[PDB]
């Protein structure tokens, strides 16, 4: 699991999935979100 | 090796490269990226709270134009003071607001601010004013953002810089445009090796900044994925076919809404089927809250509370979390001043300097003025002294004869209570003494 | 630092001033740079330091230039066997400094690296083929669907299969959170602390983290002055030799005076010394007669407020006292 | 070279070899990349197989982290304070760990001397016994000079002393008019402030005095 | 490079992009959506308790209008002085309440109030009043919402704040008002950069905030 | 802030009434506020009664007005003093 | 359970379940409820 980044981003896609409060790169994202 | 000569001989030094200096090796921490890298460093509250108390000093002082030393009471060097401090009132912002735009170095580590002139006309012209007397006063002193400015301009061989240049392409969208030295005021936090770009006070707390966010970080994740202690429901697989009776689907909807809907109350209780193998001796159902065996191996919360310690030592900055003290005063005039103060000390007395050798100097050029001295600007203090102490030191001193009292003892002990000078025309009279 | 200098002919020049007199001033005294000092040139058997050569290369691009000792000062932090690059502060804490940074990077990486509680599921290996019936490459991307979006919320829960084989009495399915059995044999964080401290200890400047005791002070005229207070009033007497015997020496010789003595450059101190000790000290030793009041006490009694030396022709008059 | 926590792997024999199926050698492929990059993370999970030997009763694979038992029978961090304490204690300069105490003082001319400025004391007098015995008589010598008697140098204090306690002692024993009072005294009395001996022409007047 | 001249060669170096200001990346912290995470922020104790001991500090103070200095005496300043007290209790609305108004940019950075004036006839007109001298005063100085304002204009180059639009499209149902920059009075927390919208103080406690609510949200479920 | 408020209520408010009013005075008056909360009292007591025994402070009826400020009494009143007929 | 975002707003319809005090995204909506 999160081991890809190439996946972790194509499952951001998934509409259906839960929010979560804080990602991993959270803490240096310039843009946010 | 050569005789000795009159005039320079070598260079600074300086790492320029095709106008961009390259005195940081960090990527990070460069021209380009800097812009954005010290933006992050300003959301954490400790780097945050640590610029906003030095830039709060620096705003609380006032400023003042008085006659150079030497000659205090010439009426010349009067009016001149006058002139000077007119001047400072009739842009088209308050000085507050320049001071403040000014400090914008505590970041960056420098500031770019253009001088515009104006002709005292009253108001028939482009900059309007409330004086008519026709000299030459201030108009404005616009910053110029630091995000903007892309080139430094040198010399033949990189002995000062000579102008600057500034790309508008992303602003809204000349879209270039080139200023020479002459025409802007540089203020730097730090200048040594004559860095044009100076160095900000954020790159002490490079390190322990990037340390606490990743642990920060961490310890948020680690808290949100805790696990222990929640239900599980074990079923044979035949349970959960698409096919199987309507019995047992009605059963796993049974089981869904009761691990959506479970919840710790005054009715909580399970009536729940149990059959254990003949031949294995393990229930075939079960329902159990998942449990953990080890423990984190270590403990963030006090690296996280290390490193804000250690970013608030920094800045020297340590009042935030400790109070103030009644060992330490924010006075220069008090023998108690901590650490804090006197590098604000340190900061006014850059801003004076440079004001007074680049600003002034020109103005008495362009009014085409030789007065053999030129007016200073000079500030105040951040908080008045102890009293105590100050009234029995003078006590004791002048009892004794030892000190003599002077009108201008006096005007300066008035200062510590806000009142002016003197008055010599309205004593405090007999009929209302008792 | 190099020294330029220049004629005060007010501005026929290239360089200009304020004055007209014809003399001989200062232009500017500018740095060079420490990385670009490259060779050091000593007199025939080394006794003395006779120039230097300064590298050009590799700053941005003649590329090589040579000054004689007579053209530059040089401060030194201090100068044992009379080595010109004296000796950086900085080799005190190198060790401290060394260990401490190295700690810090083995204890952020295993806070990266602790791993104790994860999720982990186990299937048969028949789960995982690529050939799997379509039933079973379903439950697997609901496995990953799982393991990427589980988190602690109120609704948390699981419905899973349960099967334990007749002939082994072990669940052929499984799911758990990973365990782990010691502990870290060393704690990082009293071992990092202590290098911090003795860093500290280096400078003599642990009032950083003491705070400012009530003990010590930052004053040289004041009986409580602090080591590191002592070791700056070193530096600036270091800074003051060196400009007193290195600047002004040259600048008579350059302007052709001789006068029997040069005029010194002094400083002033830190901050003012505490006023109430002075005070009492001053009544005490002056109301039995015991130390002589001169106008050159009360201008230094001044000094520690702040005033001018004196006025002799403005009094406070009786017209404002009560 | 602390290694508890650390993942480890294991696996049949067969799926390390080098002539295996390519299933096996992507198999292995994807441990090595799982092995270098798994971090905690709020992904962080795994997928693994699960197979029970029917003789046995082990499973041929695992997923586990090193344990160890055992703890370290010394703790370096009191012996390491221990022995800095005593280095200290050899020059008598524990001074830089406990602060400046109010008993201690660094003038010599108190009466409340630490130990570092007695022997530093020490120190100053042999450098002035040597210069005065080795370099102005040889000086003498070389300019042809016999005078009965050589200049001797000599240096200054450390730190001023306390102001408080010398006033109190000065009042005390002037007022009973049992010290005497000389312009000497006046003299070192005004040392203590940094003021030069006295001036007989520039007294405060009258004109400045309430 | 160019000789040296009087007046300005450069610009501000806004980021403004048709009319809406883009210093801040995060679009969580932009107009359209700042209104909503400020009043999210202020629900906090520890937030709602800073800002309003310090909107409490601020209307604790008096105000008064006193000669300017040089001519503290002089007959004439005084009179002044005195016209210009009358004015600030001669409004439609106290000038404490004025003041609190002002304070809302505690929160939001920034705030404007719009300039309303009316002759002192006494009663005879659409604005009263206790005088009669037929002067020119303040009738008041009301606010304008910060969610309601939409674009700012600039000079040709953006050197300067020309104006403000006002849009009143979901204020309970022209819909679009505009006000040049003489017509009101503009406030602001911090005007680095000169930034017409200043910086609001929450900036700094975002992410303390963020974190805080959501652990205890997280330990509220699991007690739950 | 404070200072912040009173500097655009003095450069935007005032200057546009006085151009309405087609007034010119050469100086325009300024708004000034009060402070947050009174001094302490037994510091400034002791000072004043320290530097004026020595005859260091020039006593002033501005400063007798200042003094009097920090108990909330008007500046002074020089018609009705405390009377001996009420003095034991 | 709680791991889908269309699930758990199609779950919440139902009338007659048991009503919790505070869910998990009580935090981030703007509109309360």
């Known amino acids: 699991g999160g081991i890809n980044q190439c996946d972790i981003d194509m499952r951001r896609q998934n509409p259906c999935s839960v929010k979560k409060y804080t990602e991993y790169g959270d803490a240096a994202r310039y843009e946010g979100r | ?434």
Not at chain 2, 55 to 82: H, I, S, T, Y
Not at chain 2, 113 to 128: F, H, I, S
């Open chain 2, 1 to 434: 090796l050569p005789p000795f000569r009159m005039g320079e001989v070598g260079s600074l030094g300086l790492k320029v490269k095709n106008g961009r200096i390259y005195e940081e090796p960090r990527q990070a921490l460069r021209f380009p990226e800097s812009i954005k890298t010290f933006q992050l460093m300003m959301r954490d509250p400790a780097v945050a709270a640590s610029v906003n108390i030095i830039k709060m000093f620096v705003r609380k002082v006032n400023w003042r134009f008085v006659p150079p030393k030497g000659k205090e009471q010439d009426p010349k060097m009067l009016e001149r003071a006058d002139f000077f401090n007119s001047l400072m009132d009739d842009m088209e912002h308050d000085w507050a607001d320049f001071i403040n735009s000014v400090m914008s170095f505590c970041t960056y580590g420098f500031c770019v601010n253009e001088k515009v002139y104006k002709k005292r006309q009253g108001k028939k012209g482009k900059y309007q004013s409330k004086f008519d007397d026709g000299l030459i006063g201030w108009a404005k002193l616009p910053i110029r953002n630091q995000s903007t400015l892309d080139k430094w301009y040198f010399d033949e061989d990189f002995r000062k810089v000579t102008g600057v240049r500034q790309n508008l392409r992303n602003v809204s969208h000349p879209l270039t445009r080139k200023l020479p030295r002459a025409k802007f005021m540089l203020f730097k936090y730090d200048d040594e090796y004559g860095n044009p770009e100076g160095r900000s006070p954020l790159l002490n707390a490079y390190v322990p900044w990037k340390y606490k966010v990743q642990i920060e970080e961490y310890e948020a994740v680690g808290v949100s994925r805790d696990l222990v202690g929640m239900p599980k429901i074990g079923l044979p697989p035949d349970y959960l076919d698409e096919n199987a009776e309507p019995e047992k689907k009605a059963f796993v909807q049974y089981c869904k809404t009761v691990v959506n809907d479970m919840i710790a109350n005054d009715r909580a209780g399970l009536i729940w089927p149990r059959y254990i193998d003949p031949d294995t001796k393990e229930d075939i159902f079960e329902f159990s809250l998942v449990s953990r065996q080890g423990a984190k191996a270590y403990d963030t919360g006090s690296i996280i509370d290390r490193y804000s310690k250690q970013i608030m030592m920094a800045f020297m900055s340590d009042v935030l979390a400790m109070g103030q003290s009644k060992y330490g005063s924010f006075s220069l005039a008090d023998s108690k001043t901590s650490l804090l103060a006197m590098s604000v000390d340190i900061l006014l007395k850059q801003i004076k300097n440079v004001i007074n050798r680049d600003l002034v100097a020109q103005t008495y050029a362009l009014n085409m003025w030789d007065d053999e001295e030129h007016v200073q600007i000079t500030y105040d203090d951040i908080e008045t002294p102890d009293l105590e102490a100050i009234g029995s030191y003078i006590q004791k001193t002048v009892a004794v004869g030892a000190l003599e009292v002077d009108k201008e003892l006096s005007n300066k002990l008035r200062e510590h209570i806000g009142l002016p000078p003197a008055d010599e025309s309205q004593p405090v009279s007999e009929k209302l003494s008792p």
